[PDB]
Design a protein around this ligand. Sequence first.
Ligand SMILES: N[C@@H](CCCC[NH3+])C(=O)O
Ligand SMILES: N[C@@H](CCCC[NH3+])C(=O)O
Ligand SMILES: [Fe+2]
Ligand SMILES: [Fe+2]
Ligand SMILES: [Fe+2]
Ligand SMILES: [Fe+2]
Lengths: 336, 336
Amino acid sequence: FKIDRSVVEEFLALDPDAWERLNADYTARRRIGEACRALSRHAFVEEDPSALEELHDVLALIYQQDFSGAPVELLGCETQPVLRDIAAILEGAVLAAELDSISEEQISAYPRSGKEYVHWLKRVIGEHPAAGHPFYRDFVPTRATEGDFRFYLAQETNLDPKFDDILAFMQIGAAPDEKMEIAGNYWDEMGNGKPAEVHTAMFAHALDALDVNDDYIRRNLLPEAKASGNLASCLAISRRHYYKSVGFFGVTEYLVPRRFKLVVDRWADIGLPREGIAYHDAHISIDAVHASGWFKNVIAPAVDRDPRVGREIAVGALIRLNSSQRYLDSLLMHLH
Amino acid sequence: FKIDRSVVEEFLALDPDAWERLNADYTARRRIGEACRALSRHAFVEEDPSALEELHDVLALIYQQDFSGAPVELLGCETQPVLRDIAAILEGAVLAAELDSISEEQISAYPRSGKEYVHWLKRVIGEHPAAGHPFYRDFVPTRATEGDFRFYLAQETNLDPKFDDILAFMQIGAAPDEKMEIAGNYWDEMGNGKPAEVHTAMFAHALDALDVNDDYIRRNLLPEAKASGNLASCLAISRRHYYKSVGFFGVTEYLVPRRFKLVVDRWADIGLPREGIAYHDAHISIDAVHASGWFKNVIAPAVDRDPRVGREIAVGALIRLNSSQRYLDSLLMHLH
Ligand SMILES: N[C@@H](CCCC[NH3+])C(=O)O
Ligand SMILES: N[C@@H](CCCC[NH3+])C(=O)O
Ligand SMILES: [Fe+2]
Ligand SMILES: [Fe+2]
Ligand SMILES: [Fe+2]
Ligand SMILES: [Fe+2]
């Protein structure tokens, strides 16, 4: 028995009684798990490109159930016993592969106090090529066309359309200082209460401005873009990945202003719809404040509370940087 | 093989390799599930009081992992395959028992438009005895002592200490109007950014004012209080329970002002610490606004979007009312 996206699609078509029957059958569930481990092996031991994309198509479908409003037809279907087993197996393989790229020396030399840790982390980020990737530094200012930006924005649907809920998952159970900062960040994503300023709505308008429609996205989404989106989902939704999440989205906020400024200037230079740039325009200022608040009020207090979490935060930062690098290298390569 | 709280405690003591070994052994996992179904039968078919409390002690331990910041020692432990199977089985039994108390006629006669549905729901709530329970209407104004309030507050740790995260879970994936309202409610729970006004912090101060310490809570928490807390957790953390959640916490906001006004007036009448009443004092005004916003901006738009969800919202409201009734009846009975 093989597992792939269509198999999980079929699962999600079952009615509530079919799900209950599947959930009671641990022989069928063992078979599902074994199929997941085999898919994992093809994806990350063999590194078969098709199996890797299949694995991320499966994870993306499951996270869709975690992150999207459930349809009325699914309300009685107990999907957690099977979907969480599938996600645990494929996630474990995805994360083991990220960790294979991270050395112990990268994640252990940090100072064991909060303010010092922030300086160290900013330096560690600055050394990574993703912090100044040529897609933003060279390709965008000098060559990016409307067709380029439309392809790029399609990749970016992996993260931006769900940033508010990533923050809402993350802050669950967080200590007070960290929680307060993530809460204020979430409230900013929610337009501070003004529907026109909600960030997902403004991102959607940029997508409409370049006709980044759902079918264009489906055809053009890169495997590395899928993996980036899946990593962000994976880390946000488990409490135990919280400190990884802190590093992963700390890097994210930190890098947005330099990246979006390059996109915005080029977007205006080639006369693209001023309506669409509003999303990126906004974040250039906002995320300088978000990055500063995140370092000062999330990362530094967590490290001061328990310096052992500096290692987790560093892992999550490097996961963000490494996966961003693979995504931008693949993106630039497809854009020629 | 039997399952109980201590067995799940032992699971949570395993190291990451032990969890990985357990997760790969579907024979051990089948045995765990079968033990859960047997515990369920004792709890809800036999209605053995001890098995029922054991079942809710197990669920409470699992939800603790879902809602609490993970300790550094647990960060590498993949608990989802087993804990989610246990939760799915015990939850299914808890919810089937709630639904046994809900008739089809209760949840089908509603008007299929949002503003009308709100009037109908408010009437349905008004007919339930939990909407004017004698614990608040008779016992509190005339007899409640400091020792009574301390016992009561211990029961209330089932819900209030996690209300902000219940809202954060709920709003995941919500449609825009509903999301905006839940977001503003969450931001209010977060003191609108002022740490002194964060609601969990003010609830904790009321607990300190009466010495509602962790050991007092552990000894005095009633089984119905545990079930109330577990219901709230169960509904909030699954997307498919969202519309139940909408009814469950809609009833919650609606009932707070009348309930807290009675508690506050009596608290002041018997000279208890003015510091502690600040929590309840605040909510009397705030939750009149929260209830109005919830009906107008969560319930009515959801029903106007898809009237089929009126049935789910009604189920969740009645689950709240029924479980509140059992909890307050048991509470009043223990207070003599
Ligand atoms: N997609 C952006 C992050 C935007 C964060 C959402 N507010 C990036 O990869 O740089
Ligand atoms: N424990 C309260 C609900 C308080 C809601 C938290 N802000 C009740 O049962 O009425
Ligand atoms: Fe944003
Ligand atoms: Fe931001
Ligand atoms: Fe509150
Ligand atoms: Fe409220």
